[model samples]
Target: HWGYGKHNGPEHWHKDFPIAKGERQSPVDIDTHTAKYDPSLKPLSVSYDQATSLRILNNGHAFNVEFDDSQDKAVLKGGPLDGTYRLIQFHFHWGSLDGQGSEHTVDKKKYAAELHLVHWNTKYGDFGKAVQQPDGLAVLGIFLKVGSAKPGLQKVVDVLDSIKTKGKSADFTNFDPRGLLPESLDYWTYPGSLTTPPLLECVTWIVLKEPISVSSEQVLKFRKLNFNGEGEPEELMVDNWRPAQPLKNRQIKASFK
Candidate 1:
């Protein structure tokens, strides 16, 4: 109802979004032995109808997908990667059930949700000014595990009964998130920034070591969404995640050659 008041995290979200530095922030903590681990990385042979030009957004603090540049055979190499990068957006970060949601964590295991797939760096041209440059983003981390049950994310939980209000969204259309990628794209890149509220350090994180088993009643039906408004549906945006930072000298990399 009040956007989780009390300085509302991120040291007080620039008095309410204020462009929040091109947006994209959270609680990052994926340390894989620094030095930007690069073992000759490579994984870009995409083609699932180009992942269905997805564009689902309900940004009440989760659920986002916005890739469209005609897909161009989506590409991205290793840590500190080099060249081709273009896969607009994909998002999620949750909590308030199954112990705790996720935003990035390895030796600190705690997942039940976490899926971000934002890309940019067509050498910076579009995607809204390439998110303000600086190697403009390249995120793709997926991790959502709960318990003994899985049907490949029931097509994103059947659109959660149509985004339970909170900014309501529906056209999930042809949906095809590359089958919710996770056969093992082997990743762990780093060079972070953007976990929420103008925290854009121009992300370049491809975290994904394999972990996908959603259930727990689909994370309690995505915590029943509804941060009020959009026709006021009372309250229940369950936690919405955000709490885990302080890796200042950041330097995490995997994808070992």
Candidate 2:
């Protein structure tokens, strides 16, 4: 919740989450109208074994987690994609309130927020070295619209009270993130860069068209996350999403099969 800023925000993220500088962020606006349609770059199937166990981390700022080889296996297969990627960490981008923020937009209309599950290509040896490469990252984007509530996320939300301090984290024994995944796995994909600094130019973006509905109260809970301990409450870190950037000459493709 609290980051590195006067009130704990992005200004100080690099100080703690140093990798935030190299991470491939998500939720960029995708203009279907201007997107170059390339049949050759069609969406591909991600393979994975169902026995995957997801690891949930209370990374202070937000709920960060990782997926095992099963989920990693699925994300590695980019169909026409060439290279191996492993499931890494996942976090969210949100707004001060339910009506406002989101990283990705449609025709310029923003939503409440977005979730990013970051992955690194295994082809570059290990996750550490792979993240440094231009084509070594992959991120899956999931849109969170403010609407009906989703209790599934509560499993994580319930623990907020225990680890509210900035830069602090709580360890959970066993967790499976797949339970939080919405019904369908179908998505829109493309070749793009990480939404943040040192923004890698090499990445396969997978944005799910189906959005999960979360209640407004649930959103408020996220806003409650602060940096200050006890009495000195930190400034609300909501609406932390970055606006979408130019697609350049990149091709934006979707699943047609």
Candidate 3:
């Protein structure tokens, strides 16, 4: 199955999903020196309806907090985005330890982890159809560093025991995600694809420059998850992040000077 193992890992993804080698792959290293300040970029506009929070699930890759996207309740717009986009779900990518695990490194500096807030453009009909369009998706990437404990994230970690194995899901509602975002909305934007397969090249990645903090103890909680379903072999869910891919000719435009 597709996973982080030697045979099923990212490097081997191209064999089944050739778009893995496509020009706009995601999780690129943010070279601040090379990033251009685009004056046209505006502050990110994010608003959510608390009731939209649905449930949480472990889909063999990572745990995710799914939202109600049938209507535009929790949506994102502005800042490298053309129209309003609806939030569908949010998830995280952490490491086996405190030193590394973030997807996008800054000046080659890896953080403790990373978080992705996924949304779909309303221009396309539904998520199934939107995923097929180039400008149909937008993902907000936030880096995580080790420091004091984050209460916002702790709420999600607390429910991990309920969904310890792949395919297990639990009812998790009324959790507002804005508490997890860094105060500084300044970010680096680029056109890229999904970090996971089918690795569709539809995302307009908006990666924040500032990182949130999480206690080391909290990370261990995430490490306890297994990639297996029920009675199968247990593959620990640590290091679920994708390594930074080639940047190629794409430009990283910053929202702030």
Candidate 4:
């Protein structure tokens, strides 16, 4: 029941999730002017094995494409990360409409949606153990803009019908997540937290500067998903995004020149 409603929304998260008011909360408004280009930031290294994709499911809030991380077949390194991080799963957050959906913004500019590819630090062993530490998680955020239709995203859209309700899931394998990325890997880095509940401040936020395009018609598929269970009122799962939190004392670093 912890959702984007009036009572349980971002405004009231600090009650149940005290860490929501932490110093390093995420989804901050990215001020391009104030962003400093850190020379030390290395280019992100990403390698995802298509066969590692295990399944897709409605996690009551958003849909997730889970990957196999038994041996780090799909691993992420470089950028602001010190060690390799294992890919766990990827999910999205969006609005009911196309106007404003993204969690993070550039110069306060919002996008249609945002994608989060979550990873756990290999040094900590598993995601559960890693999530408790300060440098345990690394989340790669890709902004989504409304423009040309994305065929790769369409592949995800095509399966929405099968998992229309919360807890619904399907065996979705061999889906290469690389196909969803933009041409450029230029990004901003910061210390942040999980945008959702139990908002732990463990993430090294890598937000891509370039946005991938999607058609207006395509995002409509997400609206059909239900936030509630099959027996509930069938509330649509739109507007699943959390509003941008304050930047506080943390600084944003850019990989671009």
- Misplaced by over 4 Å in model 2 are 1-27, 36-61, 67-76, 228-233
lDDT of 4 by residue, 1-257 (tens): 58988777788888889989889998899999999999998889987753388899999999999988888788889998899999999999998888888999999898999999999999999999999999999999999988899988887999989999989999988888988999999999999999999999999999999999988888888788999888899789988888889999999999998
Task: List candidate 4 segments past 4 Å from native.
Answer: none
Pairs of residues clashing in candidate 2: 1-61, 4-12, 27-103, 27-104, 47-74, 95-239
- List the pairs of residues colliding in candidate 1: 20-198, 24-194, 24-195, 25-194, 25-195, 25-196, 26-195, 26-196, 39-256, 39-257
Q: What is the lDDT of residue 23 in candidate 3?
A: 97
Clashing pairs in 4: none
Q: Considering lDDT, which of the candidate structures 1 and 4 is the better prediction for this target?
A: 4
Worst window of 10 by summed lDDT in candidate 2:
44-53
Query: For model 2, what is the alpha-carbon lDDT of residue 188?
Result: 68
Say which prediction, candidate 2 or candidate 4, comes out ahead on lDDT.
Answer: 4
> 117, model 3: CA deviation in Å?
0.3
TM-score of each: 0.32, 0.77, 0.98, 0.98
Candidate 1 per-residue lDDT over residues 57-90, each given as its tens digit: 6667666756556546455544456776777667
User: Please, what is the whole-model Cα lDDT of each candidate in the order they appear?
Assistant: 0.66, 0.63, 0.91, 0.91
